[PDB]
Symmetry: C4
Subunit: 87 residues, 4 copies
């Protein structure tokens, strides 16, 4: 169970907030969710996943998860956020 | 190694106990077991698992795991419960 | 990356030691190695693994890993033991 | 998500540094990155991965990841190093 997704963040403090003014990519490994801060971090995750599994890592776009349907809230309850402060 | 299962919980205190008067869903990721407190948490777990693996996450119902066959006790010994008080 | 294996244990102290006088099953999940101390703990691991993966969990018996070929030493360096004390 | 990769290390202090004079293998399990200091640790990882997955574990050699393309920096941000001190 792995995925990449985007969720809101405060652009000035880097704190996760439900109504953040910016968006960040996050990486879930089935254990925790961690912020992905640089596109090359995203690329290395995508590459390793593909080498292990022969297909692309699941990605949830903001067409699927957003402030009107904040499914990341549910995911982050079962795989808690690490390395960053939330709300 | 992922699964969802049900196990007993005290409906008033939220504490896991062997003779809980209610049941809660739990999620195991092969490292720990964690409580699933809302159906949308269960749905997001099921969706991510299916996107990764192309089939439904294993789910053990109370027909298979219950107080007369408390297999959750064995699973929670090898994948300890986190984030919730227990027995 | 999951497996079950056997490795020596001191039967009088419960400590993992290279020259233990008894043997215990252990469970590795790619993150840590944890002692398995009841047959039904082994069975629940085997069942969940099979439900996820469609084949049996890898198992290393004492024919493969033993005091004359202590490969468990190498595994436990990369996936450290948890929940039990070791030499 | 598992892989083996190589990255620089200080050959006298054992500390991970960007300009280490030697190289070490590391093991990533999608949660953390850990040093693989002996070839037999590499062998046991390779053997377990193959038994689970029926193919070889992804390996990033110095052909791909090196001081002029330090992709290990990106991986170690998303799966932090454990068990060793780093620059």
């Amino acid at each position: 169970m792995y995925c990449l997704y985007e969720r809101p963040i405060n652009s000035k403090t880097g704190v996760l907030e439900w109504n953040g003014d910016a968006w960040t990519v996050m990486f879930c490994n089935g254990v925790n969710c961690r912020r992905v801060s640089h596109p090359d971090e995203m690329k290395v995750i995508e590459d390793i996943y593909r080498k292990n599994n022969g297909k692309d890592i699941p990605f949830y776009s903001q067409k699927e998860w957003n402030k009107n349907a904040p499914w990341y809230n549910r995911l982050e309850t079962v795989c808690p956020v690490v390395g960053i402060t939330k709300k």
